[PDB]
Protein backbone atom coordinates (compact mmCIF):
# COMPACT_ATOMS: atom_id res chain seq x y z
CA UNK A 1 0.00 0.00 0.00
CA UNK A 2 1.37 3.41 -1.14
CA UNK A 3 1.54 4.79 2.45
CA UNK A 4 4.66 6.47 3.89
CA UNK A 5 6.15 5.33 7.24
CA UNK A 6 7.43 7.50 10.12
CA UNK A 7 10.81 6.47 11.60
CA UNK A 8 11.06 7.94 15.10
CA UNK A 9 14.64 7.59 16.37
CA UNK A 10 13.09 7.74 19.85
CA UNK A 11 16.29 7.30 21.90
CA UNK A 12 18.08 9.87 19.67
CA UNK A 13 14.98 12.15 19.80
CA UNK A 14 14.63 12.32 15.97
CA UNK A 15 11.75 11.83 13.50
CA UNK A 16 12.41 11.01 9.82
CA UNK A 17 9.51 9.93 7.54
CA UNK A 18 10.44 7.61 4.61
CA UNK A 19 8.25 6.07 1.92
CA UNK A 20 6.89 2.53 2.03
CA UNK A 21 8.69 -0.21 0.14
CA UNK A 22 7.78 0.65 -3.46
CA UNK A 23 10.52 -0.49 -5.82
CA UNK A 24 10.82 -2.75 -8.84
CA UNK A 25 12.95 -5.94 -8.73
CA UNK A 26 15.77 -4.01 -10.48
CA UNK A 27 16.19 -1.59 -7.52
CA UNK A 28 16.77 -4.50 -5.08
CA UNK A 29 20.31 -4.99 -6.47
CA UNK A 30 21.63 -1.42 -6.68
CA UNK A 31 19.99 0.48 -3.76
CA UNK A 32 20.13 -2.54 -1.37
CA UNK A 33 23.09 -3.41 0.96
CA UNK A 34 26.10 -5.68 -0.09
CA UNK A 35 24.45 -8.13 2.35
CA UNK A 36 20.78 -7.50 1.49
CA UNK A 37 21.40 -8.54 -2.13
CA UNK A 38 22.76 -11.95 -1.12
CA UNK A 39 20.24 -12.30 1.79
CA UNK A 40 17.62 -11.67 -0.92
CA UNK A 41 18.43 -15.13 -2.45
CA UNK A 42 19.26 -17.04 0.76
CA UNK A 43 16.84 -15.69 3.44
CA UNK A 44 19.99 -14.89 5.45
CA UNK A 45 22.30 -17.90 5.04
CA UNK A 46 22.94 -20.45 2.27
CA UNK A 47 24.69 -22.87 4.74
CA UNK A 48 22.63 -23.58 7.93
CA UNK A 49 25.29 -21.59 9.90
CA UNK A 50 28.56 -19.74 9.12
CA UNK A 51 30.08 -19.25 12.65
CA UNK A 52 29.19 -19.35 16.38
CA UNK A 53 29.66 -16.04 18.29
CA UNK A 54 27.58 -13.04 19.55
CA UNK A 55 30.03 -10.38 20.67
CA UNK A 56 28.24 -7.00 20.97
CA UNK A 57 27.16 -4.20 23.38
CA UNK A 58 24.23 -1.70 23.70
CA UNK A 59 25.18 0.44 20.77
CA UNK A 60 23.62 0.35 17.30
CA UNK A 61 19.99 -0.33 16.34
CA UNK A 62 18.26 -3.05 14.30
CA UNK A 63 17.80 -2.36 10.57
CA UNK A 64 15.39 -4.51 8.55
CA UNK A 65 17.71 -5.68 5.74
CA UNK A 66 14.53 -7.05 4.09
CA UNK A 67 13.29 -3.50 3.23
CA UNK A 68 16.12 -1.08 4.20
CA UNK A 69 14.30 0.56 7.19
CA UNK A 70 15.71 0.97 10.75
CA UNK A 71 13.82 0.56 14.06
CA UNK A 72 14.67 -0.90 17.50
CA UNK A 73 16.68 1.42 19.76
CA UNK A 74 18.89 -1.24 21.44
CA UNK A 75 17.58 -0.67 25.03
CA UNK A 76 14.56 -2.46 23.40
CA UNK A 77 17.02 -5.34 22.61
CA UNK A 78 19.02 -7.74 24.84
CA UNK A 79 22.79 -8.21 24.31
CA UNK A 80 24.43 -9.57 27.46
CA UNK A 81 23.10 -12.91 28.82
CA UNK A 82 21.80 -14.16 25.43
CA UNK A 83 21.40 -11.19 22.95
CA UNK A 84 18.29 -12.95 21.58
CA UNK A 85 16.01 -11.38 18.86
CA UNK A 86 13.40 -11.02 21.62
CA UNK A 87 12.68 -8.00 23.80
CA UNK A 88 10.19 -6.41 26.24
CA UNK A 89 9.22 -3.09 24.61
CA UNK A 90 9.62 -1.30 21.23
CA UNK A 91 10.62 1.93 19.45
CA UNK A 92 6.96 2.49 18.22
CA UNK A 93 4.40 1.03 15.79
CA UNK A 94 6.19 2.91 12.99
CA UNK A 95 8.10 0.22 10.99
CA UNK A 96 6.63 -2.68 13.09
CA UNK A 97 2.92 -3.60 13.43
CA UNK A 98 0.88 -5.65 15.96
CA UNK A 99 -2.60 -7.23 16.00
CA UNK A 100 -3.79 -8.38 19.45
CA UNK A 101 -4.90 -11.91 20.17
CA UNK A 102 -5.18 -14.00 23.39
CA UNK A 103 -3.43 -16.97 21.58
CA UNK A 104 -1.66 -18.37 24.70
CA UNK A 105 -4.48 -17.82 27.24
CA UNK A 106 -3.45 -14.18 28.04
CA UNK A 107 -2.03 -11.72 25.46
CA UNK A 108 -0.41 -12.91 22.24
CA UNK A 109 -0.16 -10.11 19.67
CA UNK A 110 1.51 -10.74 16.26
CA UNK A 111 4.72 -8.78 15.38
CA UNK A 112 5.26 -7.99 11.65
CA UNK A 113 7.24 -5.30 9.76
CA UNK A 114 4.79 -2.44 8.92
CA UNK A 115 6.71 -1.99 5.60
CA UNK A 116 7.37 -5.72 4.80
CA UNK A 117 5.17 -8.27 6.73
CA UNK A 118 7.52 -11.14 5.74
CA UNK A 119 7.64 -13.32 8.90
CA UNK A 120 9.10 -11.69 12.03
CA UNK A 121 7.08 -13.28 14.88
CA UNK A 122 4.92 -12.23 17.84
CA UNK A 123 4.78 -10.85 21.42
CA UNK A 124 3.57 -12.86 24.43
CA UNK A 125 2.88 -11.70 28.04
CA UNK A 126 5.70 -13.72 29.68
CA UNK A 127 8.30 -11.42 31.43
CA UNK A 128 8.55 -9.54 34.79
CA UNK A 129 6.44 -6.39 35.34
CA UNK A 130 6.23 -3.68 34.06
CA UNK A 131 7.90 -4.67 30.72
CA UNK A 132 6.61 -8.20 31.00
CA UNK A 133 5.67 -8.57 27.35
CA UNK A 134 8.10 -10.74 25.35
CA UNK A 135 8.47 -9.86 21.70
CA UNK A 136 10.35 -12.43 19.59
CA UNK A 137 11.00 -12.02 15.83
CA UNK A 138 12.63 -14.61 13.57
CA UNK A 139 13.73 -13.61 10.04
CA UNK A 140 16.75 -12.60 7.97
CA UNK A 141 15.69 -8.93 8.63
CA UNK A 142 17.90 -8.69 11.73
CA UNK A 143 20.98 -6.76 10.55
CA UNK A 144 22.30 -4.04 12.89
CA UNK A 145 23.59 -0.56 12.08
CA UNK A 146 25.26 2.16 14.21
CA UNK A 147 22.59 3.98 16.27
CA UNK A 148 21.71 6.19 13.30
CA UNK A 149 24.65 7.91 11.50
CA UNK A 150 27.00 8.48 14.55
CA UNK A 151 28.98 5.89 12.53
ZN1 LIG B 1 11.26 -4.01 7.16
Curated annotation (Swiss-Prot):
- The name this protein carries in UniProt is Peptide methionine sulfoxide reductase MsrB
Query: Which NCBIfam families does this chain map to?
Result: peptide-methionine (R)-S-oxide reductase MsrB
The record's section on InterPro entries has: Met_Sox_Rdtase_MsrB, Met_Sox_Rdtase_MsrB_dom, Mss4-like_sf
What sequence ranges are listed for the domain MsrB?
25-147
Q: Name its co-factor(s).
A: Zn(2+)
Active site annotated at which positions? 136 (nucleophile)
List the keywords (alphabetical): Metal-binding, Oxidoreductase, Zinc
Which sites bind Zn(2+)? 64, 67, 113, 116
EC number(s) per UniProt?
1.8.4.12
Q: Name one GO biological process term.
A: protein repair
Record text on cofactor binding: Binds 1 zinc ion per subunit. The zinc ion is important for the structural integrity of the protein.
Give this protein's Gene Ontology molecular function annotations.
peptide-methionine (R)-S-oxide reductase activity; zinc ion binding
| Gene Ontology annotations for the cellular component aspect, listed alphabetically | cytoplasm
Organism annotation: Methanothermobacter thermautotrophicus (strain ATCC 29096 / DSM 1053 / JCM 10044 / NBRC 100330 / Delta H) (Methanobacterium thermoautotrophicum)
Q: Which gene encodes it?
A: msrB
The family line of this record is:
Belongs to the MsrB Met sulfoxide reductase family.
| Pfam families, A to Z | SelR
> What reaction(s) does this enzyme catalyze?
L-methionyl-[protein] + [thioredoxin]-disulfide + H2O = L-methionyl-(R)-S-oxide-[protein] + [thioredoxin]-dithiol
Amino acid sequence: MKDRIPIFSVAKNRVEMVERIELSDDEWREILDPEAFRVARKAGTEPPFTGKYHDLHDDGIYRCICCGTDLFDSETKFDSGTGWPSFYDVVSEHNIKLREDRSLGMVRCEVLCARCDAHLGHVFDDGPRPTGKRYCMNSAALKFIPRDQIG
